[PDB]
From a paper:
The recombinant subunit vaccines Bexsero and Trumenba contain an important meningococcal antigen, factor H binding protein (fHbp), which is a lipoprotein composed of two β-barrels that tightly bind domains 6 and 7 of human complement factor H (CFH). fHbp is antigenically variable; databases of genome sequences contain more than 900 different fHbp peptides, which fall into three variant groups or two subfamilies: V1 (subfamily B), V2 and V3 (both subfamily A). Here we use structure-based design to generate chimeric antigens (ChAs) against serogroup B N. meningitidis. ChAs exploit fHbp as a molecular scaffold to present the surface-exposed PorA VR2 loop, which is achieved by inserting the VR2 loop into a β-turn region in fHbp. ChAs retain epitopes from both fHbp and PorA, and can elicit functional immune responses against both antigens.
We exploited soluble fHbp peptide V1.1 as a molecular scaffold to display the PorA VR2 loop, P1.16 (VR2 P1.16). VR2 P1.16 (YYTKDTNNNLTLVP) was inserted into six different β-turn regions in fHbp. We determined the atomic structures of ChAs with VR2 P1.16 inserted into position 151, 294, or 309, all of which generated PorA-dependent SBA titres. These structures were solved using molecular replacement to resolutions of 2.9 Å for fHbpV1.4:PorA151/P1.16, 3.7 Å for fHbpV1.1:PorA294/P1.16 and 2.6 Å for fHbpV1.4:PorA309/P1.16. All ChA scaffolds align with good agreement (route-mean-square deviations (RMSDs) range between 0.447 and 0.614) to fHbp V1.1, demonstrating that the fHbp scaffold is not perturbed by insertion of VR2 P1.16. In each structure VR2 P1.16 adopts a β-turn conformation that extends away from the fHbp scaffold. In ChAs, the VR2 N- and C-termini are effectively locked into a 'biological' β-turn peptide mimic by neighbouring fHbp β-strands, as confirmed by our atomic structures. Antisera raised against each ChA detected fHbp on the bacterial surface (p ≤ 0.0001), and certain antisera also demonstrated significant binding to PorA: antisera from mice immunised with alum and ChAs fHbpV1.1:PorA294/P1.16, fHbpV1.1:PorA117/P1.16, fHbpV1.1:PorA183/P1.16 or fHbpV1.1:PorA309/P1.16 (p ≤ 0.01 by two-way ANOVA), and from mice immunised with MPLA and ChAs fHbpV1.1:PorA151/P1.16, fHbpV1.1:PorA294/P1.16 or fHbpV1.1:PorA309/P1.16 (p ≤ 0.05 by two-way ANOVA). SBA titres were detected with antisera raised against fHbpV1.1:PorA294/P1.16 when alum was used as the adjuvant, and with antisera raised against fHbpV1.1:PorA151/P1.16 (a low level of SBA from a single mouse), or fHbpV1.1:PorA309/P1.16 when MPLA was the adjuvant. Although PorA was detected on the surface of N. meningitidis by antisera from mice immunised with alum and fHbpV1.1:PorA117/P1.16 or fHbpV1.1:PorA183/P1.16, or with MPLA and fHbpV1.1:PorA294/P1.16, these antigens/adjuvants did not elicit PorA-dependent SBA titres.
Numbering used by the authors: 79 to 182, 188 to 293, 293A, 293B, 293C, 293D, 293E, 293F, ...
């Protein structure tokens, strides 16, 4: 699988798919995150990069995470459980399957999406026309068999999707059509509603990822938006549930 190689071996530029994954939302500047798998364990801080080049693409790589916090002196364990990483060619996202937390150790189960990084497509460099259909995996708590189909129209700067084959019937939802907008860093992002049986059930956000090229005289020539990756919050009878979304072109 290459998990221990992803935790131990340094970054190699000849690896496939996404190579480096900057950990920012998964590890805050005051805390530390321990990852263990296949007999290896490494301690990552804030800003540290995860070597995803050794991981398999379009699959869920699972680790054992322990979230500690640095309070003046030694570290205090706040959380522990499973740490999921979904890798694509130009983007990757992380997920936290919380099993144990700190007493206020008490057993509590959660599922929260962590970092979502990659090669962001600038909103100012988007293609000005054409339809693009992205297909991929949508995965929730204890279920990675979700299928995502999200279409983007660049002429109208809109996009609508659909999630299928999830174990929870309330999570197979349709992603309402939403406009393409820039964020603070002017990345191409999409924020829309989540509908189930013609009922507004939640929200979803997808980031656009792809490569680009320049000519000999620093002029933009080629731009592609090949992947999308984000998350969704769906309301269920048992409470709010989060779902990780990733999709690419064929």
């Amino acid at each position: 699988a290459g998990l221990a190689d992803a935790l131990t071996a340094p970054l190699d530029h000849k690896d496939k798919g996404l190579q480096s994954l900057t950990l920012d939302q998964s590890v805050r500047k005051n805390e530390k995150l321990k990852l263990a798998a296949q007999g290896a364990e490494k301690t990552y801080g804030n800003g540290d990069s995860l070597n995803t080049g050794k991981l398999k693409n379009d699959k869920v790589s699972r680790f054992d995470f322990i979230r500690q916090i640095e309070v003046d002196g030694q570290l205090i364990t706040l959380e522990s459980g499973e740490f999921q990483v979904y890798k694509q060619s130009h983007s990757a996202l992380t997920a936290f399957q919380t099993e144990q937390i700190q007493d206020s150790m008490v057993a509590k189960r959660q599922f929260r999406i962590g970092d979502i990084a990659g090669e962001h497509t600038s909103f100012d460099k988007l293609p000005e026309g054409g339809r693009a259909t992205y297909r991929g995996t949508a995965f929730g708590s204890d279920d990675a068999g979700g299928k995502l189909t999200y279409t983007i129209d660049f002429a109208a700067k809109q996009g609508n999707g659909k999630i299928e084959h999830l174990k929870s019937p309330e999570l197979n939802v349709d992603l309402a059509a939403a406009d393409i907008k820039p964020d603070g860093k002017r990345h191409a992002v999409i924020s829309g509603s989540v509908l189930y049986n013609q009922a507004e059930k939640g929200s979803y956000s997808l980031g656009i990822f792809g490569y680009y090229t320049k000519d000999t005289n620093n002029n933009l020539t080629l731009v592609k938006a090949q992947e999308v990756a984000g998350s969704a919050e769906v309301k269920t009878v048992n409470g709010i549930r989060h779902i990780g979304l990733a999709a690419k072109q064929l």
